Write a protein that holds these residues in place. Structure first.
Motif, PDB file in Angstrom:
ATOM      1  N   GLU A   4      41.633  33.959  40.801  1.00  0.00           N
ATOM      2  CA  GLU A   4      42.044  34.899  41.882  1.00  0.00           C
ATOM      3  C   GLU A   4      43.360  35.639  41.647  1.00  0.00           C
ATOM      4  N   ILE A   5      43.402  36.900  42.113  1.00  0.00           N
ATOM      5  CA  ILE A   5      44.639  37.676  42.238  1.00  0.00           C
ATOM      6  C   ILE A   5      44.771  38.129  43.672  1.00  0.00           C
ATOM      7  N   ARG A   6      45.871  37.822  44.256  1.00  0.00           N
ATOM      8  CA  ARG A   6      46.144  38.209  45.598  1.00  0.00           C
ATOM      9  C   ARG A   6      47.475  38.893  45.630  1.00  0.00           C
ATOM     10  N   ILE A   7      47.458  40.168  45.750  1.00  0.00           N
ATOM     11  CA  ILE A   7      48.679  40.890  45.840  1.00  0.00           C
ATOM     12  C   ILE A   7      49.181  40.723  47.196  1.00  0.00           C
ATOM     13  N   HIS A   8      50.344  40.298  47.323  1.00  0.00           N
ATOM     14  CA  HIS A   8      50.914  40.200  48.617  1.00  0.00           C
ATOM     15  C   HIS A   8      51.741  41.435  48.732  1.00  0.00           C
ATOM     16  N   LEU A   9      51.483  42.290  49.711  1.00  0.00           N
ATOM     17  CA  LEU A   9      52.211  43.534  49.775  1.00  0.00           C
ATOM     18  C   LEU A   9      53.211  43.588  50.925  1.00  0.00           C
ATOM     19  N   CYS A  10      52.781  44.227  51.995  1.00  0.00           N
ATOM     20  CA  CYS A  10      53.576  44.508  53.196  1.00  0.00           C
ATOM     21  C   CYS A  10      54.592  45.627  52.931  1.00  0.00           C
ATOM     22  N   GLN A  11      55.209  46.083  53.981  1.00  0.00           N
ATOM     23  CA  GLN A  11      56.342  46.962  53.914  1.00  0.00           C
ATOM     24  C   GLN A  11      57.456  46.284  54.683  1.00  0.00           C
ATOM     25  N   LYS A  31      40.464  47.289  39.961  1.00  0.00           N
ATOM     26  CA  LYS A  31      39.311  46.559  40.407  1.00  0.00           C
ATOM     27  C   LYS A  31      38.151  46.816  39.455  1.00  0.00           C
ATOM     28  N   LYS A  32      38.054  48.049  38.980  1.00  0.00           N
ATOM     29  CA  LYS A  32      37.036  48.395  38.016  1.00  0.00           C
ATOM     30  C   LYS A  32      37.541  48.136  36.600  1.00  0.00           C
ATOM     31  N   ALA A  33      38.862  48.216  36.416  1.00  0.00           N
ATOM     32  CA  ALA A  33      39.450  48.106  35.101  1.00  0.00           C
ATOM     33  C   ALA A  33      39.327  46.705  34.579  1.00  0.00           C
ATOM     34  N   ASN A  34      39.455  45.778  35.489  1.00  0.00           N
ATOM     35  CA  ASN A  34      39.444  44.395  35.214  1.00  0.00           C
ATOM     36  C   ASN A  34      38.413  43.817  36.163  1.00  0.00           C
ATOM     37  N   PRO A  35      37.152  43.903  35.764  1.00  0.00           N
ATOM     38  CA  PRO A  35      35.992  43.512  36.583  1.00  0.00           C
ATOM     39  C   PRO A  35      36.056  42.085  37.004  1.00  0.00           C
ATOM     40  N   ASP A  36      36.374  41.275  36.063  1.00  0.00           N
ATOM     41  CA  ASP A  36      36.504  39.819  36.259  1.00  0.00           C
ATOM     42  C   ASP A  36      37.856  39.439  36.871  1.00  0.00           C
ATOM     43  N   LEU A  37      38.479  40.367  37.537  1.00  0.00           N
ATOM     44  CA  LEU A  37      39.739  40.117  38.163  1.00  0.00           C
ATOM     45  C   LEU A  37      39.560  40.218  39.698  1.00  0.00           C
ATOM     46  N   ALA A  53      48.465  34.942  41.460  1.00  0.00           N
ATOM     47  CA  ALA A  53      47.442  34.663  40.545  1.00  0.00           C
ATOM     48  C   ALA A  53      47.183  33.182  40.552  1.00  0.00           C
ATOM     49  N   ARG A  54      45.943  32.826  40.571  1.00  0.00           N
ATOM     50  CA  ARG A  54      45.543  31.496  40.404  1.00  0.00           C
ATOM     51  C   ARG A  54      44.456  31.594  39.385  1.00  0.00           C
ATOM     52  N   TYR A  55      44.855  31.389  38.216  1.00  0.00           N
ATOM     53  CA  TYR A  55      44.001  31.553  37.043  1.00  0.00           C
ATOM     54  C   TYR A  55      42.934  30.470  36.970  1.00  0.00           C
ATOM     55  N   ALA A  56      41.949  30.680  36.104  1.00  0.00           N
ATOM     56  CA  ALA A  56      40.929  29.660  35.824  1.00  0.00           C
ATOM     57  C   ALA A  56      41.423  28.761  34.726  1.00  0.00           C
ATOM     58  N   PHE A  57      42.582  29.116  34.201  1.00  0.00           N
ATOM     59  CA  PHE A  57      43.335  28.223  33.360  1.00  0.00           C
ATOM     60  C   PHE A  57      43.923  27.177  34.307  1.00  0.00           C
ATOM     61  N   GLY A  58      43.917  27.556  35.585  1.00  0.00           N
ATOM     62  CA  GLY A  58      44.325  26.731  36.657  1.00  0.00           C
ATOM     63  C   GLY A  58      45.813  26.670  36.800  1.00  0.00           C
ATOM     64  N   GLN A  59      46.440  27.827  36.702  1.00  0.00           N
ATOM     65  CA  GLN A  59      47.873  27.943  36.846  1.00  0.00           C
ATOM     66  C   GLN A  59      48.218  28.929  37.948  1.00  0.00           C
TER      67      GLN A  59
END
Length: 85
Positions: A4-11, A31-37, A53-59
């Motif tokens: 997973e990728i979770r951009i935390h944004l806000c203003q 989203k299209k550039a990195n399909p598996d993202l 990021a919570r990788y499948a490397f599990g980090q």
């Protein structure tokens, strides 16, 4: 390249144009550039633009990417997530 990728944004606090670029101009493109993202745009949490990021490397990755530009963040994502960490 990960779970997973979770951009935390806000203003709220220190933000960027490179971030903004990513956020708007580059969003659908990363989203299209990195399909598996997994790409989730999240809300107010810390300073402003953190890259969760919570990788499948599990980090973990949760980081203010304020200093990076649109393409570079997306490519750096691929860097990091598909095989940096």
């Amino acid at each position: 390249g990960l779970r997973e990728i979770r951009i935390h944004l806000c203003q709220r606090s220190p933000g960027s144009q490179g971030v903004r670029d990513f956020i708007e101009k580059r969003y659908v493109e990363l989203k299209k550039a990195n399909p598996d993202l997994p790409i989730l745009i999240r809300e107010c949490s810390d300073v402003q633009p953190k890259l969760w990021a919570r990788y499948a490397f599990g980090q973990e990755t949760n980081v203010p990417l304020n200093n990076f530009s649109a393409d570079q963040v997306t490519r750096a994502l691929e860097n990091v997530l598909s095989g940096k960490a």
